[PDB]
Swiss-Prot record, chains A, B:
Protein's UniProt name: 3C-like proteinase nsp5
Documented effect of changing M49A: Does not affect ability to cleave and inactivate human TRMT1
Regulation: Inhibited by pyridone-containing alpha-ketoamides compounds 13a and 13b. In turn, alpha-ketoamide 13b (tert-butyl (1-((S)-1-(((S)-4-(benzylamino)-3,4-dioxo-1-((S)-2-oxopyrrolidin-3-yl)butan-2-yl)amino)-3-cyclopropyl-1-oxopropan-2-yl)-2-oxo-1,2-dihydropyridin-3-yl)carbamate) inhibits SARS-CoV-2 replication in human lung cells. Inhibited ex vivo by michael acceptor inhibitor N3. Inhibited ex vivo by compound 11a and 11b.
Domain Peptidase C30: start-end pairs: 1-306
Superkingdom: Viruses
Subcellular location: Host cytoplasm; Host Golgi apparatus; Host nucleus
Covered residues, full protein: 3264 to 3569 of 7096
Reaction catalysis annotation: TSAVLQ-|-SGFRK-NH2 and SGVTFQ-|-GKFKK the two peptides corresponding to the two self-cleavage sites of the SARS 3C-like proteinase are the two most reactive peptide substrates. The enzyme exhibits a strong preference for substrates containing Gln at P1 position and Leu at P2 position
Active site: H41, C145
Residue ranges annotated as Cytoplasmic topological domain: 1-306
Cross-link position per record: Glycyl lysine isopeptide (Lys-Gly) (interchain with G-Cter in ubiquitin): K5, K90
Function: Cleaves the C-terminus of replicase polyprotein at 11 sites. Recognizes substrates containing the core sequence [ILMVF]-Q-|-[SGACN]. Cleaves and inactivates human TRMT1, preventing tRNA guanine(26)-dimethylation of tRNAs. May cleave human NLRP1 in lung epithelial cells, thereby activating the NLRP1 inflammasome pathway. May cleave human GSDMD, triggering alternative GSDME-mediated epithelial cell death upon activation of the NLRP1 inflammasome, which may enhance the release interleukins 1B, 6, 16 and 18. Also able to bind an ADP-ribose-1''-phosphate (ADRP).
Organism encoding this protein: Severe acute respiratory syndrome coronavirus 2
Subunit structure, as described in the record: 3CL-PRO exists as monomer and homodimer. Only the homodimer shows catalytic activity. Interacts with host FBXO22; this interaction promotes the proteasomal degradation of nsp5.
Length: 306, 306
């Protein structure tokens, strides 16, 4: 019983975090086999970040300019290249703690765990969603760059995010591990803005389903609705339009609650129209859209990792 | 920038989780050196939990009745005893992953990380507070018992909580690692209830301070107040009374914001009296009381662990 924003266990990822320095700039990198991955803006000085030419900046740099530290042991750089917005540093030592792993580009409205690091040391773990506008609402102080986002499928770590930058709103942008940004962000210190932040309707529904399973049912009503009727009300409140896939994906929650998805939409319409009247759902006075159906199932089925 | 409920890294604790079975009952235990710790109600059958005599039940049990499994390897039980509500199983194998560690009984309004486990496998990590009434609002499905609460001070794990039970409200009770319950709970399946759930005023203030440092300042006002004036308003809303210690503890936040604690109390009084008017603070439409001053400092100073 009970329902929390819970992260995956960080252990398999802790053993992959290293410290990367060029000149006066230190940030975090990801040590898998005999490659360290980090944000290429490690080669930038405070001046360069205005309008850097990365190709040009990289030409002034040799393998011996990259100080890679694993705990208190220096690694030897025997090769370096740039893949989009990441640097791949080849080291002669394979990480003996390399877990079974893969790189996935993640879809907006999917969730993942962040291990926030400073100087290659883990600081803390929390859950995030890739928002429809490809930002994240994380916690990233100075030196957190190269901190990574990940899911764990049975024994396998799927890395999906590397932190690079903060936007004027205080929200966060980064890349997949192949170094392509999520959204239209670029790694230079210019005026960039996120689009409109829409709500992940399917996730809000998953959360309502979680609430019910945990005894909170006050927001349930006598009404149903239609997909089209519901989406007319979505548009107004900058909710994502709902589709049959979304319905199908919620079937295991629908199933286990005996509550048709459309009746739950009717409950949600009523909350968007009437607000909460100072009531709470799983101790939130707002609609939470950072739990996927999968997140809710896991936490109301109790699956583990090995 | 940004502010999240973030857990400590779980890695050092993952390597301590084992599975403990008696008959048909499986739960989690904590393997430190050559001792496994788990809730003594592992010796209970579904019948026994009504009115168990643990001393009597333990007399029917020998070292070979305890199936302790570490990943996929069985450990050998060479000794067993009961310390209050925990069983200490002596095994011949010392945990080679035992981290530097200590047992602390934690004070109400302090926070810690939970590694929720099933069958000795970690499932997820989240932050909790010991509430003034000695319950916690966690996530614990069936088989989560023996999941542990912990803080990390530089390299050292301080274990503070072991999960044992859920109360009629859906909230959670357990012991310190010496096996004394937090609050007046006992490990039997009877009608027990938590006292009134008071709010941790000092933590609410820490959070307001976090908000300010992260640019949210709408709730700031022109007023100050007195300790006594503020506490008159605390009592009404079941907030904990504030003291000079509480003030002193917030000095580093006061300091770094240039905002006297009493002016922040005046802001809080105004929120308790007027509500939020559908505004948000760090994306919460309620007052958050599960961040300590220490939690806020860490996350606005950026300290790490090694």
């Amino acid at each position: 019983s009970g329902f929390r924003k819970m992260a995956f266990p960080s252990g398999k990822v802790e053993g992959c975090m290293v410290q990367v320095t060029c000149g006066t700039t230190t940030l975090n990198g990801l040590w898998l086999d005999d490659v360290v991955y980090c944000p290429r803006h490690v080669i930038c000085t405070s001046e360069d970040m205005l309008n850097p030419n990365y190709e040009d900046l990289l030409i002034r740099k040799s393998n011996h300019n990259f100080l890679v530290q694993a705990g208190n042991v220096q690694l030897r750089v025997i090769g370096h290249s740039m893949q989009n917005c990441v640097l791949k540093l080849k080291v002669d030592t394979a990480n003996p703690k390399t877990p079974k792993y893969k790189f996935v580009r993640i879809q907006p409205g999917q969730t993942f765990s962040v291990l926030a690091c400073y100087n290659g040391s883990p600081s803390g773990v929390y859950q995030c969603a890739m928002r429809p506008n490809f930002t994240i609402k994380g916690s990233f102080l100075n030196g957190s760059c190269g901190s990574v986002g990940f899911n764990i499928d049975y024994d396998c770590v799927s890395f999906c995010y590397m932190h690079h930058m903060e936007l004027p709103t205080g929200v966060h942008a980064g890349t997949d591990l192949e170094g392509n940004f999520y959204g239209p962000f670029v790694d230079r210190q210019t005026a960039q803005a996120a689009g409109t932040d829409t709500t992940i309707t399917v996730n809000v529904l998953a959360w309502l389903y979680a609430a019910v399973i945990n005894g909170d049912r006050w927001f349930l009503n006598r009404f149903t609705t239609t997909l089209n009727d519901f989406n007319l009300v979505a548009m107004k409140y900058n909710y994502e339009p709902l589709t049959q896939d979304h319905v199908d994906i919620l079937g295991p929650l629908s199933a286990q609650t005996g509550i048709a998805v459309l009746d739950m939409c009717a409950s949600l319409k009523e909350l968007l129209q009437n607000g909460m009247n100072g009531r709470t759902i799983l101790g939130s006075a707002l609609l939470e859209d950072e739990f996927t159906p999968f997140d809710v199932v896991r936490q109301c089925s109790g699956v583990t990792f090995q």
